Design a protein around this nucleic acid. Structure first.
Ligand SMILES: [Mg+2]
Ligand SMILES: [Mg+2]
Ligand SMILES: [Mg+2]
Ligand SMILES: [Mg+2]
Lengths: 225, 63, 136, 386
RNA sequence: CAGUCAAGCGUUCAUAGCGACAUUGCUUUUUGAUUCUUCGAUGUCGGCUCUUCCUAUCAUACCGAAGCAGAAUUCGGUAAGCGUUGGAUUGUUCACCCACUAAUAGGGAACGUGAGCUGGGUUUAGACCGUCGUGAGACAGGUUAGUUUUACCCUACUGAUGAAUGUUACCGCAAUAGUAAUUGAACUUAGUACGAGAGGAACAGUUCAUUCGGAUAAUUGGUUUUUGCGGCUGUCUGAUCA
RNA sequence: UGAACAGCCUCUAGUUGAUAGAAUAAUGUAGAUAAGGGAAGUCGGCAAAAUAGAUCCGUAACUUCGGGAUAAGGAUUGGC
């Protein structure tokens, strides 16, 4: 399933949510339908944490997540950090990042094995990503889009990239990430695919205005069947 | 609460005190008062202003 | 703001009246935006309609590309440079006035934002938070 | 002809006339409505405004964007020594309104309350209530006939109380005396409570408690004669205006051939009695206690007084009320704090408030330190300290 | 500006909404008509500022009717409590566009308001052009430059004292007078009711905001004769210190 | 001091005359400063602000070839 969901009318689910294999994060100011989608589809096996990052309802663009670790900005308060430490399982590691770009979901596009980052990140932050997430890192842009997290949706099975992407960039990124990539649109043609939707190994959640060919492209590239 | 440090003088900043300034290169500065804020805007070096923590650390005064 | 607001906004000190020229932060090829109107502003005799951070305005491109000049379009203020207070009581300000171009529903005409944006704007507009590099 | 552009009226017509108040202590024009089921308690209290400070607390509003997040708010401090009960009075109700019929005083009156009955205290024989105390020290003869008179009549019982001005840093020495309504029990229970509490002190926590919405009645800060531009907020006339520009241009039409009362004009600004409602109590502090300024999260033993004392006031050695926001009147002024006239739910009047940190830095400048121990620890040793 | 009548329109159907041919009115924000008052002079455009009043109600409150399924809209009632904006051009009133908004309703008060302002226009004397005139000169034709006086009196209004009520002091009562709050958005209800679909509400609840008002100065900003501290120029006190 | 019988301070000489005292309300007259915006004000940028000396670099259209021109636009300046 690519599950049709709105955040109070918003068809961008990746902005307000962060979904990994092991956990899920949702914003505190959410509707009953928005919570019920993650509660029904994810089930009781996977914890869902209602969280606020840096005083903001936006959490997907603020944080970058992995099954092994979670990265939070510097502006995240101690109460939010302690609540995430209690609510999250003991396996994941939560570490604050002290870096100027500070919006880790926009900066970092990552999965379990390999990650794409903004080219201009600091070397200490790159080593921190490689340490906490245990993930090999490449500094690359998707056809000149420096915000790889906003302009790519990535999982273990496959990836969706920006629609206006050069084909040569598509095989280059596909060989670099060792996963097949498809250029496509989400939410009735919105270009920002990573902000448009969240995905993991068995679930994808998207906006209600995402059309049927777009949803078919999603389930084909992410192998959710 | 959190007690922040003055970006110019190193003084302790209590909640609701002073000002904050986000520069165009996305760097955050925090000023405890208008005196240190105005010295920052006048582009003085805190290594040469005699009452700052960075000056006293440089000059080994009370260290 | 008005239609495309995702939630409400606390009152930010108004810093951009009508006639203000702000930098154009996105990559749409426009250089500055000239504010002619503020969405949701009230009516008072002689009072100029002023804008704050996170507000949607009506603006014209005074300097930039000729297909963007000589027409009115909606814009969103992302940097204010007039100091305002949050409910945790820090007084903060950027060093320039800056906004991006959008449609009336709020999605950006451009694709990337240079420089910081305010969290009071990023929470209120998700597309701005999507294309934003750093949110403070 | 008609006005070309509409605009709202400058100023509020219900706060007229903007004259000086009759006294420096504002009158309580209305008390909370009585019900004869609760125990006997006062409806109000007297204190002295000391100054303002900030706190940090965790906001609890389920639905706000700042839910479960720290906010910093401005509070004002009212120094409240325990008030001294001297006297009760009863009011019968006539077709021309309420009317007092008797007043029964306490026996021993202190000097600070009997200074209220004098303009030249230093040259006096101090003969005040001397024949009244001579009416006392019998068995009961001239006393409980007036008390049973208040029981037999007098549908409203009010208590004469007076502050303890000598416990405050003020240099006045002459206490303030007031009537406070009792709002519990029957008439006999009210006057029995008063008779038992003659010459006794009543503390502020007996009448107030935390998270209570109260009203402040006080006379505002005076400003003397003021022009129309700041007194009423009218628009300044343009720069090239002959004969001045802080004025109102048209003060009326040709007809009616008089200046109307509704036209804004120059005169006295400030020193008006005001009643400001719905102020939440954050802390009822005890003066017989160190760590008044400490919370459960801060836990550093410091009193509520800032560094260098409150500016123009002094110390807070007595009990105090920390109340949210601004109240009318300036520092060192008598202020009457009153219970609310109605029950407010509002999901804001019912919020339970627990403070996290109280500011005790100096208000006589940009204070950097909360305690002298913290200042000494930060700055190290000085030349004056050996 | 409003009636009455009803041939017609409105698929059908006078009157949901309209309505010809007629005919009865009201108003004094039009323009005339008249010449009563003022020629020993009532300062004649417009704008700015400010108060109050009227209702023939643009919006907001509660309702009735529909060619009212919902959404949007139209007609009407009680209603003047409350509001009715920012600009480009023009001296303008008016107009015409841009835009926001719940809405950008109409008017009066000596065509409100010049010892309140302004002086762009008109409306002196300088000057130019066009037309007219032999000429001096003329032109609600165009253009440019052109002194805006006085309140200290009485009343009114805003504030401030105060004799006399045996004296003085404290605490009060309340006749009368005034009065104040206003409007919107988002979430949810709910893609629900309704509908064939396109579309698409409302009540209760929550969080904010606009306009207004009364205070206040903990914080932030402004202000500096704290001439408080430091720096700098020129000169003077022989130099130094000051 | 400085280009200078400019402005500012001093020497010789000459005055110390102009009803005064006490407080520091409004409105004035004269002098000033203002966050963010920058003519949205107004008939109209009225008024105020900004620029300013000197040295070096650089200087357009047009022209009656003489100019425009300090065009515009940049950099520097103390003490030892
Ligand atoms: Mg105006
Ligand atoms: Mg008028
Ligand atoms: Mg009108
Ligand atoms: Mg202070």
């Amino acid at each position: 399933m690519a599950t049709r969901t709105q955040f109070e009318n918003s068809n961008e689910i990746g902005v307000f949510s962060k979904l990994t294999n092991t956990y899920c994060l949702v914003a505190v100011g959410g509707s009953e339908n928005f919570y019920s989608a993650f509660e029904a589809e994810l089930g009781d096996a996977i914890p869902i944490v209602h969280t606020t990052i840096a005083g903001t309802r936006i959490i997907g663009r603020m944080t970058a997540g992995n099954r092994r670790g979670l990265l939070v900005p510097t502006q995240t308060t101690d109460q939010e950090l302690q609540h995430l430490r209690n609510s999250l399982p003991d396996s994941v590691k939560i570490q604050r990042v002290e870096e100027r770009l500070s919006a880790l979901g926009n900066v970092i596009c990552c999965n379990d094995y390999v990650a794409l980052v903004h080219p201009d990140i600091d070397r200490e932050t790159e080593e921190l990503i490689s340490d906490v997430l245990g993930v090999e890192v490449f500094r690359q842009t998707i056809s000149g889009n420096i915000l790889v997290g906003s302009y790519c949706s990535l999982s273990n099975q496959g990836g969706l990239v920006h629609p206006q992407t050069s084909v040569q960039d598509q095989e280059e990124l596909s060989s670099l990430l060792q996963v097949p990539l498809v250029a496509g649109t989400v939410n009735r043609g919105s270009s920002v695919v990573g902000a448009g939707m969240v995905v993991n190994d068995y679930l994808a959640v998207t906006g209600l205005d995402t059309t049927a060919p777009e949803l078919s492209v999603i389930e084909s590239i992410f192998r959710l069947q | 609460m959190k007690v922040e440090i003055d970006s110019f003088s190193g003084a302790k900043i209590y909640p609701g005190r002073g000002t904050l300034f986000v520069r165009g290169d996305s760097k955050i500065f925090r000023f405890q008062n208008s005196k240190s804020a105005s010295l920052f805007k006048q582009r003085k070096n805190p290594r040469r202003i005699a009452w700052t923590v960075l000056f006293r650390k440089h000059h080994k005064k009370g260290i | 703001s008005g239609n495309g607001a995702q939630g409400t906004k606390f009152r930010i000190s108004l810093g951009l009246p009508v006639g203000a020229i702000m930098n154009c932060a996105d990559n749409s090829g426009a250089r500055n935006l000239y504010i002619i109107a503020v969405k949701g502003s009230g009516s008072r005799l002689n009072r100029l309609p002023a804008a704050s951070l996170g507000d949607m305005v009506m603006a014209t491109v005074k300097k930039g590309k000729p297909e963007l000049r000589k027409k009115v379009m909606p814009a969103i203020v992302v940097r204010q440079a007039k100091s305002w207070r949050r409910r945790d009581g820090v007084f903060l300000y950027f060093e320039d006035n800056a906004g991006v171009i959008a449609n009336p529903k709020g999605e950006m005409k451009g694709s990337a934002i240079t420089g910081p944006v305010g969290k009071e704007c990023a929470d209120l507009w998700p597309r701005v938070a999507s294309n934003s590099g750093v949110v403070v | 002809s008609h006005r070309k552009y509409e605009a709202p009226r400058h100023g509020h017509l219900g706060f007229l006339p903007r004259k000086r108040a009759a006294s420096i202590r504002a009158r309580v024009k209305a008390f909370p409505k009585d019900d004869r089921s609760k125990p006997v308690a006062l409806t109000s209290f007297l204190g002295y405004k000391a100054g303002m400070t900030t706190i940090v607390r965790d906001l609890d509003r389920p639905g706000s964007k700042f839910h479960k997040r720290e906010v910093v708010e401005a509070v004002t401090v009212v120094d409240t020594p325990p008030v001294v009960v001297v006297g009760v009075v009863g009011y019968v109700e006539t077709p021309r309104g309420l009317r007092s019929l008797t007043t029964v005083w306490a026996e021993h009156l202190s000097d600070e309350v009997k200074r209220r009955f004098y303009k030249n205290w230093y040259k006096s024989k101090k003969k005040a209530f001397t024949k009244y105390s001579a009416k006392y020290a019998q068995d009961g003869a001239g006393i409980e006939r007036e008390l049973a008179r208040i029981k037999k009549y007098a549908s409203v019982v009010r208590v004469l109380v007076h502050t303890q001005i000598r416990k405050t840093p003020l240099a006045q020495k002459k206490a303030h005396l007031a009537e406070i309504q009792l709002n519990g029990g029957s008439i006999s229970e009210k006057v029995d409570w008063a008779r038992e509490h003659f010459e006794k002190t009543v503390a502020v926590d007996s009448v107030f408690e935390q998270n209570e919405m109260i009203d402040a009645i006080a006379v505002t800060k005076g400003h003397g004669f003021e022009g129309v531009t700041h007194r009423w907020g009218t628009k300044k006339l343009p720069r090239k205006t002959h004969r001045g520009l802080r004025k109102v241009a048209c003060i009326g039409a040709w007809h009616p051939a008089h200046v109307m009362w509704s036209v804004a004009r120059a005169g006295q600004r400030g020193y008006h009695s005001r009643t400001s409602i719905n102020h939440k109590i954050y802390r009822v502090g005890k003066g017989d206690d160190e760590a008044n300024g400490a919370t459960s999260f801060d836990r550093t033993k410091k009193t509520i007084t800032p560094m260098g004392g409150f500016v123009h006031y002094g110390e807070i050695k007595n009990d105090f009320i920390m109340v949210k926001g601004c109240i009318p009147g300036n520092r060192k002024r008598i202020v009457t704090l009153r219970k609310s006239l109605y029950t407010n739910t509002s999901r804001k009047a019912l919020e339970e408030v627990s403070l996290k940190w109280i500011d005790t830095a100096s208000k006589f400048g940009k204070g950097r330190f909360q305690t002298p121990a913290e200042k000494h620890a930060f700055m190290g040793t000085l030349k004056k300290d050996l």
